Amino acid sequence: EVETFAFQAEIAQLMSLIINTFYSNKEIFLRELISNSSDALDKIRYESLTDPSKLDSGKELHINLIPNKQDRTLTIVDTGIGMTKADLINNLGTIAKSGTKAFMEALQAGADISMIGQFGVGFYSAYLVAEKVTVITKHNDDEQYAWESSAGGSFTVRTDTGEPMGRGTKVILHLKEDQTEYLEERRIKEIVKKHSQFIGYPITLFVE
Amino acid sequence: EVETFAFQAEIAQLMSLIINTFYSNKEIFLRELISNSSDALDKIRYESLTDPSKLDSGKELHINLIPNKQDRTLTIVDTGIGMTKADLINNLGTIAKSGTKAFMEALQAGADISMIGQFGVGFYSAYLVAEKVTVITKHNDDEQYAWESSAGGSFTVRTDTGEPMGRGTKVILHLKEDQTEYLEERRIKEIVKKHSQFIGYPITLFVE
Ligand SMILES: CCNC(=O)c1noc(-c2cc(Cl)c(O)cc2O)c1-c1ccc(CN2CCOCC2)cc1
Ligand SMILES: CCNC(=O)c1noc(-c2cc(Cl)c(O)cc2O)c1-c1ccc(CN2CCOCC2)cc1
Numbered sequence A, B: 001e002v003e004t005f006a007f008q009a010e011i012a013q014l015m016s017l018i019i020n021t022f023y024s025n026k027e028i029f030l031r032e033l034i035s036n037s038s039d040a041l042d043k044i045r046y047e048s049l050t051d052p053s054k055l056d057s058g059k060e061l062h063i064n065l066i067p068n069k070q071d072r073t074l075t076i077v078d079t080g081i082g083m084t085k086a087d088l089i090n091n092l093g094t095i096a097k098s099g100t101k102a103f104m105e106a107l108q109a110g111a112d113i114s115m116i117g118q119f120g121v122g123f124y125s126a127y128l129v130a131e132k133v134t135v136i137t138k139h140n141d142d143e144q145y146a147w148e149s150s151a152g153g154s155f156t157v158r159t160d161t162g163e164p165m166g167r168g169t170k171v172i173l174h175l176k177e178d179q180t181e182y183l184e185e186r187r188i189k190e191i192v193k194k195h196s197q198f199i200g201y202p203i204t205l206f207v208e
Helices: A009-020 A026-050 A085-089 A096-107 A113-119 A122-128 A177-183 A185-195 B009-020 B026-050 B085-089 B096-107 B113-119 B122-128 B177-183 B185-195
Strands: A003-006 A063-068 A073-078 A130-138 A145-149 A154-159 A168-175 A203-205 B003-006 B063-068 B073-078 B130-138 B145-149 B154-159 B168-175 B203-205
Touching: A009 A096, A009 A122, A026 A063, A026 A073, A026 A113, A026 A122, A026 A168, A026 A177, A026 A185, A063 A185, A085 A145, A085 A154, A096 A113, A113 A122, A122 A130, A168 A177, A177 A185, A185 A203, B009 B096, B009 B122, B026 B063, B026 B073, B026 B113, B026 B122, B026 B168, B026 B177, B026 B185, B063 B185, B085 B145, B085 B154, B096 B113, B113 B122, B122 B130, B168 B177, B177 B185, B185 B203
Parallel strands: A063 A203, B063 B203
Antiparallel strands: A003 A154, A063 A073, A073 A168, A130 A145, A130 A168, A145 A154, B003 B154, B063 B073, B073 B168, B130 B145, B130 B168, B145 B154
């Protein structure tokens, strides 16, 4: 099953900076992730325009936000384009090694961590709140994989045999002990209404 | 040489709204276009990571801004991924038909035209200043094309036999009579310093 890779050295600094820096405006991790879903959904819609059967694996394009106080996870599910195992290994389809240089350069010269998405490494903002992020994803041209890391230098990539999903990506956020506010329905509706009000796909906040 | 297509009916409304609406903060067309370059450069860098020879058609990734008071054009040149003729026909690789619905919905309910990029139809902001936009583009898997429209319902797509470019996209903006401020070096440096200060590729403002 499991393979264990090392984060590129600059990404590992990024994550460390994100875990360590005192910084109180954490709610943005959501914007970043929903806004990744949105991009993922854009692409499958772009692709469907010319091949309408690429949409065979789900004809409806949406984001669901699924809280679970018990398991202590927030899960964002979308039915976008998905990634290949190769994409997941290559920094979740980002240009991370260079976005971290840009971002890094930006931080000591003014910028604050909210600006992270502007460098296309918005994903790692996940680590403002999650002590463990598992990314489950299915692309049309591949098996369903699972990506996982609790940070500290290395991530993992098993092919997944959990619940098939047809197409999209699913980010389970195993939340930090003191970060459980982002499982409260009040708080999530707030953050989405504040920061993701212009996302052109429906966003369904599940209720427990 | 030339083929003549019709804008999808909703895009044609978009452009008409952009030409007609009284709206004084026009300088944003630049942000939109440079920020399209940036995305185009991201992709060829993403692609080079796994195939480093895709970069054979230019190993350096950048944006040049080239003013010409004489011809009355502003030209933005980048060496990003480029588009296929199929991409250019399909709304310059956007999901325009739906981004215009989202945008449209947003406008009557608060939003102003600066928010256009958030709907992935930021290109048309070009028509806040250009009376004619010509897009010249070369992808690795195709000939160099030219896209053109002065709006009014229809655009054009010739294969291009002007100056080869290796790889990227080039948007010549044939500027409106009273919109020549965006050929002044003062003004362009301003708009870029204000709105495109965090673009992770060099931006070279040519001098006349
Ligand atoms: C290669 C083709 N597939 C995709 O790009 C894809 N499929 O699924 C996702 C994705 C990624 C993440 Cl982190 C999510 O939280 C959700 C999601 O759908 C993605 C994304 C991966 C990465 C990114 C981040 N960017 C890619 C380039 O940098 C600008 C933003 C957005 C979406
Ligand atoms: C299909 C693969 N190729 C490309 O995507 C590409 N190559 O070159 C460009 C491009 C487009 C425009 Cl309008 C420019 O001004 C510059 C440029 O490089 C592009 C772009 C086309 C369209 C867009 C607009 N978006 C695409 C999806 O919506 C979010 C932003 C950005 C870049």
